[PDB]
Ligand binder design. Structure first.
Ligand SMILES: Cc1cn([C@H]2C[C@H](O)[C@@H](COP(=O)(O)O)O2)c(=O)[nH]c1=O
Ligand SMILES: Cc1cn([C@H]2C[C@H](O)[C@@H](COP(=O)(O)O)O2)c(=O)[nH]c1=O
Lengths: 190, 190
């Protein structure tokens, strides 16, 4: 067993996650490393195109409905992701189950709790590290992201997404690099 | 609290569930009762039309993906269903979470268990009675339906779907009628 690391980037919209994920992937390749970039929702599947329609406000879904649909989109990619990590390929993943929970809880729907919202993604891979880009609807998403982060300060590392692009990139590298060495370990699951 | 009963019909395809559900609804109305008929998957929503495309083999979904999507389609209707029962309206429901489990387990996918498959539908209403129409892919769906039925012989009543239409209708009435009187009770959940 020689496995890659599983790195998740989380945060509110506009936090520069998309760019910082491409940069981390570039640093890992500059270290001769094998790495793939995954982004959720995965819009390339049939369900992902439905989700894209949802995000464009062309189709509607209730809170619990939408929660399970975004989770199904993640569950769909677990065989591919497990194969890649086991081959030794690192995964950098932009948004994951935590976005799923935070965006679902921020809707304030009746009869949803955090305990309920954790059921949908059970069995999915657990990341070796979650990088949270810390920078209204987005305001309550951040509140949930803070509660998740403080629930598990082992997994969650918080970067200052207000600093410069190159500066954030540097701080992310400094957190992630020790993990790349240390994991080559059993897979962890939610 | 004066609530209606929640009756689920389950079984393999071709078991006459669709007709027997319309007949039960007719008997309840003939008893002056308020009743609505619900069928899953609910093809009238945006997600339900996606599911219809799935069943027509026009879109694809992996086992775990499909499981959560069919479950989201059920979760979507829970506010409506709870409102109806609380108003005293009986619900006769053709297919439910149990079909969801059975059809999902019959695919024989890797890394699915019955324990996993029960997570998606948690929080949904639990029926007061499940009528199982007892009459290859459909062969393993029946095997799962038998295991579910024998797990909980309080809830599950098994009818002989080989007898005549009018005869099955009679046997279903004889099981359901005592429940209609007795529930008018707290709601039960999965
Ligand atoms: C992964 C995920 C994303 N989202 C949202 C966050 C974004 O507003 C949107 C698309 O994200 P994106 O901009 O990163 O593509 O989908 C959810 O609502 N639930 C989820 O589970
Ligand atoms: C409710 C439900 C139905 N199904 C299947 C059973 C049928 O083959 C099909 C449509 O059922 P229908 O003929 O009762 O409309 O969908 C699932 O695969 N999963 C589910 O959760």
């Amino acid at each position: 067993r020689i496995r890659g690391a599983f790195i998740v980037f989380e945060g509110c919209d506009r936090a520069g996650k998309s760019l910082q994920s491409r940069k981390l992937v570039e640093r890992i390749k500059a270290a001769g490393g094998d790495v793939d970039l995954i982004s959720f929702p995965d819009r390339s599947s049939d369900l992902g195109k439905f989700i894209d329609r949802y995000l464009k406000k062309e189709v509607e879904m209730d809170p619990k409905e939408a929660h399970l649909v975004f989770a199904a989109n993640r569950q769909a990619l677990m065989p591919l992701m497990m194969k890649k990590l086991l081959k030794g390929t690192h995964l950098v993943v932009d948004r994951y189950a935590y976005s799923g929970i935070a965006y679902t809880l921020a809707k304030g729907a009746d009869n949803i709790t955090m305990e309920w919202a954790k059921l949908a993604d059970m069995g999915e891979l657990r990341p070796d590290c979650v990088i949270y880009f810390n920078l209204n609807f987005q305001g309550k998403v951040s509140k949930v992201m803070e509660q998740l982060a403080d629930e598990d300060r082992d997994l969650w590392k918080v970067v200052d997404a207000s600093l410069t692009v190159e500066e954030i990139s540097e701080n992310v590298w400094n957190l992630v690099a020790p993990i790349l060495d240390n994991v080559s370990k059993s897979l962890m699951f939610l």
